[PDB]
Design a binder for these strands. Structure first.
Ligand SMILES: [Mg+2]
Ligand SMILES: [Mg+2]
Ligand SMILES: [Os+3]
Ligand SMILES: [Os+3]
Length: 67
RNA sequence: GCCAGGAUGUAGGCUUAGAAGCAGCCAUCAUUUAAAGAAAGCGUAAUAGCUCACUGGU
């Protein structure tokens, strides 16, 4: 595996922790720039077809932690 | 009924000595799918294992 979506997103987002997500979003960050990048690096471990799918998943982990 | 799948990010986040689907608090997305819950029970110290939901076959 490579750094989990969580840590990748943490380091990306620029934080050391997650949240209570729906309520207190922990930070914002640029998708088409950043979420895509992570989607790229995480690809060897993603069962995704297109990068666009690879993304949907990453963005999906960002929600669970609120970003 | 019986046979076989029940999966990937991922041990979701947080918290917690541990907290991994299954103490508790937030959520509960998305992927690849014929289908397959951020899991409905049992199980574990935590893991693992087992079932269940859904799908195929007969
Ligand atoms: Mg299981
Ligand atoms: Mg899963
Ligand atoms: Os089995
Ligand atoms: Os689905």
């Amino acid at each position: 595996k490579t750094p989990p979506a969580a840590v990748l997103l943490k380091k990306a987002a620029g934080i050391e922790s997650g949240s209570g997500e729906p309520n207190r979003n922990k930070v914002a960050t640029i998708k088409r720039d950043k979420v895509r990048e992570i989607a790229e690096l995480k690809m060897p471990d993603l069962n995704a077809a297109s990068i666009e799918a690879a993304m949907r998943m990453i963005e999906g982990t960002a929600r669970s932690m609120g970003i």
